[PDB]
Design a protein around this ligand. Structure first.
Ligand code: JKQ
Ligand SMILES: OC[C@H]1O[C@H](O[C@H]2[C@H](O)[C@@H](O)[C@@H](O)O[C@@H]2CO)[C@H](O)[C@@H](O)[C@@H]1O
Ligand code: NA
Length: 513
């Protein structure tokens, strides 16, 4: 099994206090003889699910809590079971952030929210509104400075503004209700785009560029989290940390993250990982070592948070946090961020209009759920002979028309392939939920081998329906939902970009109209 026993490998993002974490690791080694390696791989949040699915990767992964539901759904995390006395050492709301399907899937570390960071020597009174920024930038440009620079390549940083006037990810979670392309989101992202068009900001600005400009005194404000304050301390900029500006009179609403540590389900060192996280890291001295390297924010550990809470920068962080919302941890968060990242980048660069960009983001964010709705309904009605009577939601005319198209087209595909499907089904031993796991390997492989088009997607789904009929016949109707989920995963994981390019299921209805 790929992960080595008797050592701990930890992954944490490169903007965090990884040298402090490695000090905690040295302490552990001194008491236990177990060496701890801390690494900060690029794109770790994307790499983890790839490697862990093979039984490889780090023993411990640190990331905000939003990615952890996806990893837990995929079976990539160990359930953690801290006892009552340990649970009571942390804030309950930090535990809530790492609860998925009623199980704790990670240890919470610290609460992170973005704030407005400003240079007090350039801007003694920071703007209370977004709307006053253009005028401020004009005033600053006369003196060779700019008003505001922040990372436009990661949507986390633009989210507070998108959300201010009513953008939202998933309504509180109703995965059916997505608010990425509503009027509020459009208003916020249009304001950003106008800043860029009026040369108050540059579309190419990334994390490093914005940090460098702020810490060199070139720009009067940035938007960043507590991890950033160490580099600003070293630069000797006189800075303040404050509430984000309002937009259309309403607060900026940052997405609040709880930095959390999960244990790899494939680790043979789970007991050492638990001992390290509970008895070395989540202690006053452990968190202090980390926080001294790069500030964590509002830590989850009550004893130590009471000391940090007196710092005005933490107060500001918590003020922004209360105006914001805790991120969801559901599995489609990954897709939501991918869609939104592209929409912001393309709207900023002018490759797409705001309307265009947010439409595509809404399609991408809704794709898994919409696909599972169609596929699960078609498989279940095929298997049983009766349609599901529940409505689709308020966003569900697309689901409905896609199901109707699928019935029409799929009737013929199953009819014409009945002999071939009967043959393929016989080769396979599909008798219970264990077997369906295997099918995913087969179905991915077979599906990916050929060309990408709607006809072949209909054939994949049609075979799924043929299997569902068989499942029902042998009293394994409970396997139909897992089959539908597995087909949906295959389809959206391998064809997401192609699907969004087609306008999702509306494209399907169009192709076969
Ligand atoms: C694992 C079962 C799947 S998934 C799938 N996805 C798209 N298309 C498929 N079949 C067509 C003919 C295609 O490739 O266009 C299949 C088959 C499938 C099913 C039965 C068969 N008999 C011979 C070959 C074959 C293939
Ligand atoms: O930009 C989308 C991105 O947002 C959040 O990632 C944050 C992270 O939480 C912070 O700890 C800090 O590292 O900056 C990151 C943004 O660059 C989400 O947690 C992440 O899943 C998402 O992709
Ligand atoms: Na990164």
């Amino acid at each position: 099994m790929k992960i080595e026993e008797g050592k701990l490998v930890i992954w944490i993002n490169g903007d965090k206090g990884y040298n402090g974490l490695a000090e905690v690791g040295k302490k552990f080694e001194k008491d236990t003889g177990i060496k701890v390696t801390v690494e900060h791989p690029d794109k770790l949040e994307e790499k983890f699910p790839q490697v862990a699915a093979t039984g490889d990767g780090p023993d411990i992964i640190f990331w905000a809590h939003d990615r952890f539901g996806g990893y837990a759904q995929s079976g990539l995390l160990a359930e953690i079971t801290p006892d009552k006395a340990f649970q009571d050492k942390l804030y309950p709301f930090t535990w809530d952030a790492v609860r998925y399907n009623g199980k704790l899937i990670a240890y919470p570390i610290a609460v992170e929210a973005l704030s407005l960071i400003y240079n007090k020597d350039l801007l003694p009174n920071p703007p209370k509104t977004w709307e006053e920024i253009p005028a401020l930038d004009k005033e600053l440009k006369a003196k060779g400075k700019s008003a505001l620079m922040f990372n436009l390549q990661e949507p986390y940083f633009t989210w507070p503004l998108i959300a201010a006037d009513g953008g939202y990810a998933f309504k509180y979670y109703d995965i059916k209700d997505v608010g990425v392309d509503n009027a509020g989101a459009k208003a916020g992202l249009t304001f950003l785009v106008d800043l860029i068009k009026n040369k108050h900001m540059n579309a190419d600005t990334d994390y490093s560029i914005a940090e460098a400009a702020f810490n060199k005194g070139e720009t009067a404000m940035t938007i960043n989290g507590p991890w950033a304050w160490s580099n600003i301390d070293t630069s000797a900029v006189n800075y303040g940390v404050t509430v984000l500006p309002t937009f259309k009179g309403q607060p900026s609403k940052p997405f609040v993250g709880v930095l959390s540590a999960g244990i790899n389900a494939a680790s043979p060192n789970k007991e050492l990982a638990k001992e390290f996280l509970e008895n070395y890291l989540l202690t006053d001295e452990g968190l202090e070592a980390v926080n001294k390297d790069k500030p964590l924010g509002a830590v989850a550990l009550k004893s130590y948070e009471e000391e940090l809470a007196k710092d005005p920068r933490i107060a500001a962080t918590m003020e922004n946090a209360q105006k914001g919302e805790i991120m969801p941890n559901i599995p489609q968060m990954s897709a939501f961020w991918y869609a939104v990242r592209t929409a912001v980048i393309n709207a900023a660069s002018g490759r797409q209009t705001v309307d265009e960009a947010l439409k595509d983001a809404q399609t991408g964010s809704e794709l898994y759920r919409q696909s599972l709705e169609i596929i699960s309904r078609y498989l279940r009605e095929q298997a049983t002979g009766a349609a599901d009577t529940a409505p689709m939601g308020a966003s569900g005319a697309t689901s409905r028309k896609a199901l109707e198209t699928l019935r029409r087209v799929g009737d013929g595909v199953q009819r014409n392939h009945e002999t071939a499907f009967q043959g393929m089904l016989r080769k396979l031993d599909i008798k219970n939920e264990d077997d369906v796991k295997s099918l995913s390997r087969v179905m991915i492989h077979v599906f990916s081998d050929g060309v990408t088009n709607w006809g072949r997607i209909v054939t994949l789904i049609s075979f799924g329906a043929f299997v569902a009929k068989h499942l029902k016949t042998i009293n394994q109707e409970s396997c139909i939902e897992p089959l539908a989920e597995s087909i949906t995963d295959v389809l959206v994981r391998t064809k997401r970009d192609w699907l969004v390019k087609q306008r999702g299921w509306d494209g399907f209805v169009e192709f076969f109209h």
